[PDB]
Amino acid sequence: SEVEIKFKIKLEDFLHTLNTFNPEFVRYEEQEDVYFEVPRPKLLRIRGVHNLKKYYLTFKEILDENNEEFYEVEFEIGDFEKAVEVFKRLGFKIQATIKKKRWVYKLNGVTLEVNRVEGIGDFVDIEVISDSPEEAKEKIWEVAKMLGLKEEDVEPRLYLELINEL
Template sequence: MEVEVKFRVSFDDMKGKIEDLGAEFKGEELQEDLYFSLPHPELLRVRWIRNLGRAYITYKYIQDPGKNEEFDELEVEVSDFKTAVEILRRLGFKEDVLVKKRRLVYKLGDVTFELSDVEGLGSFLDIEILSDDVVYAKERIWEVAKRLGLAEKDVEPRLYQELLKEK
């Protein structure tokens, strides 16, 4: 299970705080996420990481719709973004939203920080843990979030693609 909480942040300010925490920088990714229309609470996405030349097909089932913090996730890397998109089109899936972002990834133990500047939406920090123990994961995420000065009021429960469609 992928457990994550998304916060609205100031990019440069949060970058400094994450680094001060001693988190290890894992890399920068220029991501283009193409979402296909799928009945709620399922998600289907093809991600292209432009600067690394890598692409992924990802299926997610949202376990807590509305809150959007618990995801059952299946992902495979694919050899070509455009061909993967075309196969899904041929199989009848319709393109919905394209989310473009610059993302910095950090790790601190079992916690992953994804600090993103999302085109048209601003900056966000996803704090993520892979664990089937949701209670533990949420506690650990909030423990780290508080050390970064984040609070409940900073949480953004909506998905990026929902935010883009609401604009």
């Protein structure tokens, strides 16, 4: 039960704003995400993290039209390419491939995921893992307003949707 809101940013401006509140740095990932076509509201992707030599298989159910609410199951895998192969051979089509750099920062009960996404742009995802969407969204909006972010900065589309449109 992830609650999440995504904001368009200019990474440069935003890293000043962020250093001002100087949050805890968690981790850095150079990610390659391969999405496979599945009926909505499902998502299926294999992620490779080049810099860490880690790989993941992720399944999500999108739980609302906003794309702010997700059920997720994920686990590590030993081999990126073999997983992609298996799914191809199972007759799944590759819907999109997405490259991005991501810095994860933490505050009290909130995660900030600063994303630089090849061919699309820069975004911050403000996330809370909660069993209560309303309270979660309030925390996220408090953080966003603290960082000078507006409703007009909200990106409602999935990166998958943005790459396909782009």
